[PDB]
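User: Please fill in residues for this 462-position structure.
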């Protein structure tokens, strides 16, 4: 008898979105153990390996243990999804902790990189490669100041094909090793990516940058970088020597993770116990992160509007089919089956796969619109409220990211800032400039939140 994910775990809430799918906070129905479950949709994510080799990898991943690697507990598969059940970490993404700090030094950078290299070293010893190591794969175990870094997604890229969509690709290009682009790669690609992260920790700027994804990739492929920014004079020679060794082009000549742990810089800056703060780096990192998160948020918002266009008409068609008399009236149980159908096929809400969760969601919608749950209900009104709820939630989510980005509380994003944001979002320059011209009818060279939102709607066919 095949084990079923929903027989064991109940979803608590959505934690967020990472490579290959959504991540839900779930709870064991017997033991109360909380876990983070990555839900991978088989429709949206292609497997690179056969069923056999995935199961073997899962079996190995479950037996591995290292304080800087996410612990994997369980693996399930049904007709539409894979469910990877791992340990929940509450400290958030590393870069989001770093920007909140008042000070940041080479000591703090070295302690971070030692952890990352320690985890990588351990995984490489077990023949597992990450390939997609980047700052958002570095979580802090908890919100404690001394919290360990946990690397997420080790081994997934070997089995699952990366998305080609920009909403899924934000940030990837800065960190990818050149050899990954060309097709022949091995565990050394993780050292390159860690070298890129280190470069960013110490200067707050990517070593390989550009105005759009392809220009970033062209720089990565050339493999050349400099330490000629003003940030770099504050920085020890040994740190730059380690970075050089990690950003060595030919992988056979590149330093291994284990040898990087013995490097002078790691040895000097992580030992027992006066190092100056890297203030310009923190400032740069603040700006870098803010830009990445707004571009991410903008893409997410556009995707949510498109998903709504899709799901709003489908849900209406599902209920119309169920409505035998054509009176427009369905009961709660029918609303639940109709909503269930919608969720199974679309797979845009991993939290709505369990039937109990859909029952709960319908009751939340019904409770919102003052409809009695025990009688017959006008479905067209339920559809409106259920979709309007989602639409409101999406807009609120974009706004929070707009406010986050607007660090001086100006209420505006300048035209220069839009260029950077849309460049990161890989929205064509002539296209957004054109949309900006339709919205900014007075050449102010800046947009407030509503205007930014209007641009995004125009940039997804509205
Ligand atoms: C940041 C956020 C919401 C995207 N996230 N993501 C995870 C996470 C990442 C990769 C996984 C791979 C296999 C199984 C579970 C996984 C969970 C994760 C986590 N464990 N704990 C906290 N947040 C997490």
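Assistant: Residues filled in for all 462 positions:
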């Amino acid at each position: 008898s095949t084990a079923i994910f929903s027989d064991r775990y109940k979803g608590q809430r959505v934690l967020g979105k990472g490579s290959f799918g959504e991540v839900i906070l779930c709870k064991d129905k017997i033991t109360g153990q909380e876990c983070a479950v990555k839900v991978i949709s088989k429709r949206q994510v292609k497997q690179k390996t056969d069923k056999e080799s995935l199961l073997r990898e899962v079996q190995l991943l479950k037996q591995l243990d290292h304080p800087n690697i996410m612990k994997l507990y369980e693996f399930f598969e049904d007709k539409g999804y894979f469910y990877l059940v791992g340990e929940v970490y509450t400290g958030g993404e590393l870069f989001d902790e770093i920007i909140s700090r008042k000070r940041f030094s080479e000591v703090d950078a070295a302690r971070i990189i030692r952890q990352v290299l320690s985890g990588i070293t351990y995984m490489h010893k077990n023949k597992i490669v990450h390939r997609d190591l980047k700052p958002e794969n570095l979580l802090l175990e908890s919100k404690s100041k001394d919290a360990n870094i946990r690397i997420i997604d080790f081994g997934l890229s070997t089995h699952f094909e990366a998305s080609k969509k920009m909403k899924d690709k934000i940030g990837t290009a800065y960190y990818i090793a050149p050899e990954v682009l060309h097709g022949t790669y091995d565990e050394k690609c993780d050292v390159w990516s860690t070298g890129v992260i280190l470069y960013i920790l110490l200067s707050g700027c990517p070593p390989f940058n550009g105005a759009n994804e392809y220009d970033i990739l062209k720089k990565v492929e050339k493999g050349k970088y400099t330490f000629e920014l003003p940030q770099w004079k504050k920085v020890s020679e040994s740190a730059k020597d380690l970075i050089r060794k990690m950003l060595t082009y030919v992988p056979s000549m590149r330093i291994s993770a284990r040898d990087a742990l013995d490097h002078e810089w790691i040895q000097t800056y992580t030992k027992e116990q006066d190092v100056p703060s890297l203030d310009n780096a923190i400032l740069n990192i603040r700006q870098f992160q803010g830009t990445q998160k707004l571009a991410q948020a903008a893409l997410l918002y556009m995707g949510s509007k498109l998903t709504s266009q899709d799901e709003t008409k489908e849900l209406t068609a599902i209920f119309h089919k169920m409505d035998k008399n054509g009176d427009g009236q369905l009961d709660r149980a029918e609303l639940i089956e109709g909503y269930k159908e919608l969720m199974r096929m679309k797979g845009q809400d991993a939290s709505m796969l369990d039937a109990s969760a859909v029952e709960h969601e319908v009751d939340q919608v019904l409770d919102a619109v003052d409809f009695d749950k025990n009688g017959y209900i006008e479905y067209s009104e339920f559809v409106t409220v259920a979709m309007d709820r989602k639409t409101l939630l999406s807009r609120e989510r974009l706004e929070r990211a707009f406010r986050m980005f607007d660090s001086d509380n100006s209420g505006k994003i300048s035209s220069t800032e839009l260029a950077t944001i849309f460049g990161v979002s890989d929205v064509d320059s002539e296209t957004w400039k054109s949309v900006l011209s339709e919205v900014d009818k007075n050449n102010d060279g800046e947009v407030d939140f509503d205007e930014f939102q209007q641009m995004l709607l125009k940039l997804c066919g509205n």
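For context: Residues 419 and 433 are 8 Å apart (CA to CA).
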